[PDB]
Symmetry: none
Subunit: 131 residues, 7 copies
């Protein structure tokens, strides 16, 4: 499995980053957001066979769309909220809800990263860069 | 023959699942519906040379369209009600009748999966996922 | 030569079947029509190098378009009435007449199978199915 | 050579046949026309490297266009009247004359085989059939 | 170098032929025209690396367009009047008239062969035929 | 990493050149512009795996887009202002402003080289030329 | 590097030729124009890795577009006036000026060869001919 950083092409310096909770980057449920690119383990990801982006912070930590559209790392499972696919420079969630929309990895406000409905996603360009 | 789970792309966690009958998942005539994905034997399927989806629950259990459009596993024979083919993420039965329509594998409410006329099949996206 | 059943995709369970004459499935001139699929010898066919569909019921029994468009098995010869080719799931006869049309293998009601002018052949999907 | 019968696809049973003349089928200048297919040597042909159809009745007997569109077998030479090429199921002569047309092997009426101007050749389908 | 005859497809029996001068086919400046095909050396040609058609009559005898558009065999040189190329069954000279006219090998009457402006080359089909 | 000069195809003799500061071509912050091509160290560049153009003048000197679109060499980092990619003879910056504008390496008068919005870039052809 | 003559396809016998100055074909600044083709060293050329056409008359002599659009041989350098590329039978200079046009190697009357704006280049067909 190929390990990558996920760098925004919509901001001159922002990578997808596991913040964690209270200093601990390895915890299940740890927050994921944007940070300046440095390429440490908490900015490294790998796309597995089940379309999940696994973080290098620890075993069994997958990138997860939450109900309020924020991102965390969680135990890896079958839910579409953990499945991701690329179309060009767009990184798209398989998450479904009642809105009839695809949700895209997106910077919404300043440097805050979440998923955003396709028709609203103004800063949604990304590049997977081999580590 | 590749063994797959049949996971919905229209529901965040539903796989095609042999419920069985009377607690026994191996029984001829057992019911098929949807369930949280766990990838056990009663959620593993293989498409054979005759376009039948064989369940891994036991020998000679093929996914079958019933007269009322519910699904079961039955002994494998020649009927078109046991034949399936893919078009993109749609899984289509070869079953024919007088209603000028193709029937698609479709979630019809809750954890219930049946086949539904094409023009009405709104929860009908699937991904055959190798195991 | 691949041995196949010829199964309908226009009927939930129908295979091209040599009925024969008076119980004998092997006779020249025997009727061919539809039946539930079972894969026994009178439902097995082979497409030969002359584009004929040879039946397994006996030597020298080829699927034949008759003048009235019904199907029988007959001694194998050169006639276009015995020549068949595929386009997708359509099985087409090389038979010619004065009506400017191709004739397709077609279910014409119940278990009756005949050939039908292309533009009117509405139950005419088939799958040559490798014998199991 | 690939030895073939030349069977019509415009008639339920007609092959290109050396009739001959005097009952002798080997004679130069012998007539060629249509007959029910039987694959004896007077219906077997081989296309040589100079695009001539050589009959198996005897040595040096090529299929030849005459100016009145009738067909014979004649000694083999360089004339375009003896050169043939395929376009799909059409068998076309290289013969030229003042009528600015390509001539196609064709059943003119009944069982009468000649060559015919392309725009008039309505029974001109053939299958070169391996012996 | 493939030795060929150059047979017309516009005439039922005509090959490009070195007439010579007074019975001698090998003479420099010898006339070139058409004849019935027999494939002797004065009808055999080979296309060389400089796009010249060399006659098999004798060494250093190239098919040459003259200013008056007649054909001869001459010593081999660099002039475009000795260069030839095929487009389909057309055999085209690289000769420049200053007109932007392409001159095609063409039968101009009886057994006379010359090159002719493309727009009016009415008998200019050829087949290079392996010997 | 292949080492190249970046020679303009929009000016008869201009190469991308580190001017440096006070004759010192090695300084961080040194200006980059155009000069006649000579291929000394301050005209040699290498594209690295992070898509940065590293100058040969000294270690850790990457070609950098500034906020006013002028070019310098700076310490190498992760910022898009230092990332470049080719499309034919165009060398495109990943630098982001608000406008969705792509900025191209472009001559903007005399020997002045900067990045210019794609629609305006009239002298933006370049050839990466092996040393 | 393949040694070629550059022969016109727009004139029946013209090759690109180093005239030199005063009988010396070797001198820097020597004139280049058209001549009957003979393939001596002053008509032999080689396209190098920098897209320069080097002449065989002497070392370090490249075909050079001058400001007045005449051609000479000069010491080999980086200028686009010495760079050449092929598009079909067109030999195109990389020379740029005020006019937004490509300049093509072109016969401009008699044996005068120059570069001409593409739109007006009507004797500009060439064949690089292996020696």
């Amino acid at each position: 499995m190929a390990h990558v950083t996920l760098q925004s092409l919509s901001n001159n310096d922002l990578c997808l980053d596991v913040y964690g909770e209270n200093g601990d980057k390895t915890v299940a449920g740890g927050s994921v957001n944007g940070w300046s690119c440095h390429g440490s383990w908490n900015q490294v990801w790998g796309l597995d066979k089940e379309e999940r982006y696994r973080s290098r912070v620890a075993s069994d930590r997958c990138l997860t769309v939450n109900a309020d559209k924020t991102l965390t790392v969680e135990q890896c499972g079958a839910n579409l909220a953990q499945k991701w696919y690329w179309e060009g420079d767009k990184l798209i969630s398989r998450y479904v809800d009642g809105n009839n929309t695809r949700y895209l990895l997106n910077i919404v406000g300043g440097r805050n990263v979440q998923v955003t409905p396709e028709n609203e996603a103004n800063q949604a360009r990304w590049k997977p860069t081999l580590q």
